[PDB]
Amino acid sequence: RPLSELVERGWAAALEPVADQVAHMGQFLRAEIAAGRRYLPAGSNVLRAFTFPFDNVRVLIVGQDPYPTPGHAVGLSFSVAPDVRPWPRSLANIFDEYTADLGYPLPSNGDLTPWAQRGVLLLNRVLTVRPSNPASHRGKGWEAVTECAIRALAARAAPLVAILWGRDASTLKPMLAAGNCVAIESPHPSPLSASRGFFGSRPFSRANELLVGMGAEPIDWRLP
Ligand SMILES: O=c1[nH]cc(Cl)c(=O)[nH]1
Ligand SMILES: [Cl-]
């Protein structure tokens, strides 16, 4: 019940304003299971982005909703388990822009853990979904929780670059209007939108140049 049991302490402190809302989400999800409507990712993964330190975030990535196919979503936006192939479509697209931007080899697997360990917060606007039903928990109460997370990140003294992928960009930028923050957007990396501005957007090196402009250290994006 205390957030301190589910997330890292800095996050628990940051999210105390929505701790009741998080408790109501737990009840909603419990009811979904009782109704035979599973949800994804696994319960223990829902708040996984908030298990890496709040104080160490330098880059915030915000996507839309978790992967709807069972066996994909792991609670870090866009990430999959390291044995997963094919990669989901959005991640394949992400990884092509990665190589085009940074010149590194194509990654071996789809596990974005290393980014999360290096201060990239891999957030979705909505933290759960019903299996095979894209975006099906929109409007169910997560937006209050992720707004609190974003706003708390922005309120810290430290430099932050937010990378906003998809339709939530315009709602989120006002949350990130503060002096130590830069928010950069593009259409979502899913294939129907990616062709319209995700490809060629160079978010990884852009984010690093902006961090260096703020006197912060750039992210080591290199995946194995
Ligand atoms: O974790 C995510 N997976 C898939 C999508 Cl489309 C997204 O926006 N976020
Ligand atoms: Cl996808």
UniProtKB/Swiss-Prot annotation:
| Compartments where found | Cytoplasm
Keyword DNA damage set for record: yes
Q: Where is the active site?
A: 65 (proton acceptor)
| Any Pfam family | UDG
Q: Domain of life here?
A: Bacteria
Q: InterPro entries per the record?
A: UDG_fam1, Ura-DNA_Glyclase_AS, Uracil-DNA_glycosylase-like, Uracil-DNA_glycosylase-like_sf
Any idea which UniProt keywords this protein has? Cytoplasm, DNA damage, DNA repair, Hydrolase
Question: EC number(s) of the enzyme?
Answer: 3.2.2.27
Disulfide pattern: none
Top-level EC class as recorded in UniProt: hydrolase
Question: Which SUPFAM superfamilies does the entry link to?
Answer: Uracil-DNA glycosylase-like
The record ties this protein, via PROSITE patterns, to: U_DNA_GLYCOSYLASE (PS00130)
Q: What GO molecular function terms would the record report?
A: uracil DNA N-glycosylase activity
The catalysed reaction is: Hydrolyzes single-stranded DNA or mismatched double-stranded DNA and polynucleotides, releasing free uracil
Q: Name one GO cellular component term.
A: cytoplasm
Concerning CDD domains, the annotation shows: UDG-F1-like (cd10027)
Q: Per the UniProt entry, what is one GO biological process?
A: base-excision repair
HAMAP family according to UniProt: UDG (MF_00148)
Q: Give a short account of what the protein does.
A: Excises uracil residues from the DNA which can arise as a result of misincorporation of dUMP residues by DNA polymerase or due to deamination of cytosine.
Report the sequence similarity comment from the record. Answer: Belongs to the uracil-DNA glycosylase (UDG) superfamily. UNG family.
What is the protein's name according to its record?
A: Uracil-DNA glycosylase
Q: Which gene encodes it?
A: ung
